[PDB]
């Protein structure tokens, strides 16, 4: 056989061995592997070649083996030691193989050294254990994106392992939520990025838990540039993803600008929400001093507390406050708290120095950012100079309700525009002589020189109706409301009008707001006795318990009546008599008014209706009217009724109209009255007007009557220079057709003293005091005519 | 033979080949590996069994074995590659030799399954990348504590290779400094150390600096539980302490508030402090296309740049922006870039979202959180309103200048308390019509709707004159000038009215400030030549150079002249005749009134001496006087001056004052009015008054005459209302002893018309024209009397 050599020479060293477990054929290869000789070896027990410790098993080991034959079973290579000549030791690759000719049973083992195998078995073990060293999950992944290998790290956050996640996709392996943020487009993307790439998603654990992962895919090439493999490592970021919020948060809240305390709370409640069940405390420093800046706990004892006191340090390096933070007993790691720690003095540091900034201006400023009006200072020295000049005002100290809801739900850059807005309105109404300033927060102090009260309670429902319809920020609309405390006092510090005013407010404020009041209540009761008087006179005008008294008007030669003018007149069961000096300027102010005028107007008609009745010729009736109620649009409608419900056509019907009313000028109210004057029914003005050239004007308007006030004429009798007053407006009088009135006659001198210049008609109290109409017809019949 | 079989039934395949390359020996082994059949392989060639790729190379190297001698070598034992009969390729371990029989060449190879070889080698691959791979340097170490294992993050973090590193002793590789003694001693308790335990030490580098770390060591065990390994994990400090310092710097910047290139400056600057010799780029995208946001300030290259790129999201999956971050290769670390490149990312989030939230509140601000004023939107839309409405307003642009020197001096909290101030300056002037905005910095815009060249150079005038006194901040002055461009045109929009006052404003505060302008060059020439008209009026009056005329005044019974009135006239060479109507209300605004005054009141006096020095007997001389000229607390003094110096006691001379002196209601103006017309002069009152009752407040200041105007006069005929005016005028005449002067007239019909009414003189073209002074002497002595 030519093959004798061939397995002689091999690289394999090849050991034969024959019934006997005695050596019968060896190689030179098994000789340099062994260390023996040919005839070292030849016809000796393998037990010699086994190492020592095998010495006894080794003989049963192949007995068992013959005795079971499994049909020529040859084992499998391996690897195993070996002896050597001195005793040294060898990793070997052995194969076995099992011979059986002419009946019997022969082995032969075939052997090459190992060293480099074993050398790559130890570089596997230790890389193994480098591997499942740290705690960063890392796993690797084919061409065709399925995941080939694992480490402890990642089984132990994701409950998988390589058994059951061997060859199969990644996006299949991890569950998503469903579609919370489309975070599954996001995740195929990041696995089929062809460059170095990051991101972060949402999973869930294998049990299934809410946790957010970073997940940094890598591409690794191979020598011919082809893609070869892509490593994915993972990072958990709950931890992170808080603190970012924190920060986020505080940010926020402090581009807005906010002031200290809320600026504090806002950072105490933020680091709170990182850290569950834990105390925060805040202190500055103030010359060394600590001051609480902010809080924020539940009151809770908090068992072995583990305290820790960061420190802020200011741009140059100087401490400036102190931050306490207080956890539970291992809440959380100390890591953890530091870093928390550390952010948030980065980023109080800037809140702290602002503050001190703020205040070592704010010792001597005399203006105010943020709405630009003055300020407490301006304020105390505007007081100061009115207290010293002894001029007592009357302050109004007005705070701003509802503005906290705005602050909640729009913030801060929302809760200012809303402070200009009304701020603005304030100065589309305050008048040259009010003086508006802010003190602080939604505060503000208005200055007035009113010393009246039916003026100050005009001004307060001014104040108040200013803000009555809502402020339209956002495109949503904010509804604010106003408290008021108002104090005016004589000889009285800045302090005092303060403090009263501050507890008037306060007041208005804790029993609701939304309204004004005075402080004191001697002056507080006068407006509860006005509205009382009020609400009584309104109840009197609806329930028709009004009255008119006429006063006749007399003819300075004839003695004949020429007409009457109409007095309303009231008496109250609770109130007596109420003079129409008192209540006439009250219905003015509530605007019952109109009211007044349309039950006059009717009343009037109504009269001479019944008059005519009866044989009474009453040439003409005097009514007068309000400039407010000339002032609408509906006068014409309820006159005309009067009269064609009653046959009292405007021949007879007379008005009288106030001098302000041609003072001012409407063409409007101008046009109503000269359809009214057209319709028959005349015009009188008291007061002779304001000036020729108005009345001129009143010329071109038409009239009929001019009417001397009472003052000129009493004043007639001292005064010789207004005589000519008298002459001029009754030379007006037959110049172009005017009846001159004289009023309030009380002696028969007056009466003779101005007959000599011509005075068409005299009304007053020589002749007859206004009378009831039970007894006109009376006093018609009766005197007619009088003394001349 | 017995060996045949045995190669037969040995596990591993085995074949032989001679010179003629045929395969005699194929075992069943090498059937199951091929698949090949032993009919099919037993006389053929090797090329039914080499690969195909490798057939054109395979006789090379048969060639050069069978030629060039290897001193009878066996060969190599190795992986190599196998294709089935199907196709497939596997990997087998090969052992070839080469034996030479009967003196001919003979290869002999034997081949495994190697599957398991396949497996091994591969994992081993795929496991040396994610040891390379973890961000963290991790070493293992022997028993006898020699460095086996080194990972890729160790190697380039202290430059110390695997071959450098292999087998040796870490303190012998890492050799920490002589100084201080210590770390030695520290160094090895911590190496020999069983236990886990974690230091601080100051190993070095192979090229240099000092590092300090922190270092732990683990040791892993076997199951006889015996130290198998250890496993030794390193830290750095400084690059730990540098990511802080990082995060907290680039927050402080965003908590201040910076724009946004100042914002992507200082990252960028703070990415370059912490990394060394880098250049990063930042993109922010807009509409899905990147722009630009900032950059290096080092626009240059550094060799072997390496470049890592990060996309910032925003809260979501939609990409906000690119961050590029280049350095030399071998500068710094991997995991340091990470970690650089991850917080940059988090923080430029941050930056992201607080400019788009600072943007979309700017968009709908309609206020301004300083000086309270409204703002650029709230301007806007008033002039949209206005243009729309078809109302062409003035626009001024005011630009406060010399503000920088506060900055300098105090800071900017008392800046803005100067810009405070100012703007209250601004609040206590502006008129209830005119809009008051601020758009920008030390700009404001001032919008009025009287398009009077007058009065815009009045409110102009008042404007600029506010900064007249200096701010008052802290008790130290500091001056301040406006810079104010006019812009008004017909039928114009918000932006071309806005552009054209910017570019006034820009013109006058880079040809220095402190003024205003119009935009149009025509406005400025009428404005050029008012002023020289104004200075020529000055230049004038100061050189004596007025001339006064005189207008007889006729009895309207006698036809004698009751009087004359002086008005005065004034000449010049370049502008020819200038009417009183147009220079005397220019010296109104001048101040030159006073002036006037006295020039006018010598004149007339002196030439009531030159008439009398002859016959003339001049019955009275009318002299117009102006209310400012009134209201000076001097008038007694030149007028006694004026009679006791020519003889001109006050009987003659007589003083007309206009109709809205005795509007105004002044005491001092009275009493000295009483003063006056106890010396003897008259007094006349001219366009009536108010109201007659102020005339008759007036007897107390008594007066002799009444002018009936103009305008009056010649619309007499056709309205025949006012003529009882007239009536009543005269009527007032001969009640108390006054004269009515009828002025204006021209037609003999108008004359014969106030006949009846019994106007007491006439003055009008009808008798005489205003008369040059020289000829005066002539008509007393030629036409009087005019016999009517
Ligand atoms: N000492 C004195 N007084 C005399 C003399 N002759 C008349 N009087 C008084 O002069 C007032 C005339 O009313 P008036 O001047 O229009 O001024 C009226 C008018 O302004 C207002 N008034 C009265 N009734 C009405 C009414 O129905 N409507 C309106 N709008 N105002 C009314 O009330 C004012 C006061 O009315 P009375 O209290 O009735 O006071 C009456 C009357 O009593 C006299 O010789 N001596
Ligand atoms: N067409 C016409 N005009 C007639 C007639 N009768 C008089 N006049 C004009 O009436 C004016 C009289 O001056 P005035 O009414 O006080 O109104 C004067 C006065 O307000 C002012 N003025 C004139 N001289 C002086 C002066 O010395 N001082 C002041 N302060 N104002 C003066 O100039 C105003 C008018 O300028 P004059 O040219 O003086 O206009 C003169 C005169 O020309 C007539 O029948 N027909
Ligand atoms: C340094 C030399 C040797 C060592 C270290 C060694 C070691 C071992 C050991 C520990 C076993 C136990 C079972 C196993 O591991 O599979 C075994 C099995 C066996 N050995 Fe050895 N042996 C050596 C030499 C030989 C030789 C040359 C033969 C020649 C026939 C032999 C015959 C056997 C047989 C027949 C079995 C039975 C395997 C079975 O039944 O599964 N041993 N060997
Ligand atoms: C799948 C089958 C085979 C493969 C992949 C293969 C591959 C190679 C390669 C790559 C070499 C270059 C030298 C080296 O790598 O050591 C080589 C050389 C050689 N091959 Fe093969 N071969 C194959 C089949 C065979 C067979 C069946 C024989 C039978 C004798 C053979 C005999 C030789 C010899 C003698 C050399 C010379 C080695 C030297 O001179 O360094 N080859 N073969
Ligand atoms: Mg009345
Ligand atoms: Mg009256
Ligand atoms: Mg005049
Ligand atoms: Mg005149």
């Known amino acids: 056989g030519i093959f004798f050599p061939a397995l002689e020479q091999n690289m394999m060293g090849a050991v034969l061995i024959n019934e006997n477990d005695e050596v019968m054929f060896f190689n030179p290869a098994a000789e340099k592997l062994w260390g023996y000789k040919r005839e070292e070896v030849i016809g000796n027990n393998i037990d010699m070649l086994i190492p020592r410790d095998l010495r006894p ?139 170095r790439d990051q991101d972060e998603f949402l999973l869930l654990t294998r049990t299934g838990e809410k946790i957010w992962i970073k997940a940094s895919i890598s591409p690794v090439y191979d020598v011919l540039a082809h893609l070869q493999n892509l490593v994915m490592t993972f990072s958990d970021i709950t931890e992170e993803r808080q603190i970012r919020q924190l920060e986020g948060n505080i940010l926020a809240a402090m581009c807005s600008s906010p002031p200290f305390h809320e600026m504090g709370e806002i950072i105490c409640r933020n680091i709170e929400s990182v850290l569950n069940e834990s105390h925060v405390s805040l202190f500055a420093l103030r010359n060394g001093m600590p001051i609480h800046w902010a809080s924020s706990s539940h009151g809770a004892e908090i068992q072995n507390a583990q305290s820790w006191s960061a420190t802020i340090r200011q741009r140059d390096g100087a401490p400036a406050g102190i931050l306490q933070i207080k956890t539970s007993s291992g809440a959380e790691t100390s890591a953890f708290i530091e870093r928390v720690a550390d952010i948030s003095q980065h980023m109080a540091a800037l809140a702290l120095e602002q503050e001190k900034s703020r205040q070592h201006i704010e010792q001597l400023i005399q203006f105010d950012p943020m709405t630009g009006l003055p300020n407490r200072n301006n304020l105390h020295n505007y007081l100061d100079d009115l207290v010293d000049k002894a001029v007592s005002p009357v302050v109004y100290l007005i705070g701003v309700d509802h503005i906290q809801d705005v602050i909640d739900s729009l913030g801060y850059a929302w809760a200012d525009q809303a402070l200009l807005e009304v701020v603005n309105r304030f100065r589309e109404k305050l008048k040259p002589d009010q003086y508006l300033c802010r003190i602080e927060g939604t505060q503000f102090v208005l200055v007035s020189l009113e010393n009246d009260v039916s003026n ?298 101005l007959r000599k210049i011509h005075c068409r008609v005299i009304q007053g109290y020589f002749f007859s005091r206004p009378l009831p109409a039970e007894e006109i017809p009376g006093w018609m019949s009766s005197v007619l005519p009088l003394k001349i």
């Open 456 to 753: 100050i309670t005009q001004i307060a429902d001014e104040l108040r109706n200013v803000v009555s319809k809502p402020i339209m920020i956002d495109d949503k609309p904010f509804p604010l409301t106003l408290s008021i405390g108002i104090s005016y006092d004589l000889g009285k510090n800045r302090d005092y009008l303060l403090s009263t005013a501050h507890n008037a407010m306060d007041y208005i404020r804790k029993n609701g707001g939304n309204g004004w009041q005075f402080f004191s209540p001697a002056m507080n009761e006068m407006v509860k006795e006005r509205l009382v008087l009020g609400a009584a006179l309104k109840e009197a005008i609806s329930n028709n318990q009004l009255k008119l008294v006429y006063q006749p008007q007399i003819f300075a030669e004839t003695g004949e009546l020429y007409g009457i003018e109409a007095l309303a007149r009231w008496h109250d069961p609770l109130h007596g008599h109420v003079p129409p000096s008192r209540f006439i300027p009250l219905a003015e102010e509530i605007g019952e008014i109109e009211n007044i005028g349309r039950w006059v107007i009717a009343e009037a008609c109504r009269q001479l209706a019944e008059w005519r009745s009866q044989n009474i010729h009453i040439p003409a009736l005097s009514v007068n009217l309000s400039a407010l109620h000339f002032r609408s649009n509906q006068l014409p409608n309820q006159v005309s009724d009067a009269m064609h419900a009653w046959g009292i056509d405007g021949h007879q019907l007379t008005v009288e109209i106030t001098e302000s009313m041609m003072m001012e000028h409407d063409t409007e109210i101008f046009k109503r009255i000269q359809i009214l004057r057209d319709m028959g029914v005349g015009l009188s003005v008291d007061d002779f007007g304001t000036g020729f050239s108005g009345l001129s004007r009143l010329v071109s308007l038409p009239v009929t009557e001019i009417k001397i006030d009472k003052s000129f004429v009493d004043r007639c009798l001292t005064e010789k220079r207004i005589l000519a007053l008298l002459e001029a407006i009754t030379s007006i009088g037959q110049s172009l057709n005017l009846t001159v009135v004289a009023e309030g006659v009380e002696t028969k001198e007056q009466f003779e003293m």
């Open 57 to 195: 098993a080794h003989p049963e080991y192949i007995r068992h083996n013959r005795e079971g034959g499994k049909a020529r079973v040859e084992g499998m290579s391996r690897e195993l030691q070996l002896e050597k000549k001195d005793g040294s030791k060898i990793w070997t690759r052995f194969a076995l193989s099992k011979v059986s000719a002419e009946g019997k049973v022969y082995y032969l083992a075939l052997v090459r050294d190992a060293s480099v195998e074993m050398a790559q078995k130890e570089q596997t073990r230790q890389l193994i254990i480098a591997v499942d060293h740290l705690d960063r999950p890392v796993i690797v992944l084919d061409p065709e994106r399925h995941i080939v290998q694992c480490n402890r790290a990642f089984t132990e956050m994701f409950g998988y392992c390589i058994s059951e996640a061997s060859g199969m996709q990644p996006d299949t392996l991890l569950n998503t939520p469903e579609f919370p943020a489309d975070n599954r487009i996001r995740l195929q993307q990041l696995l089929w990025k062809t460059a």
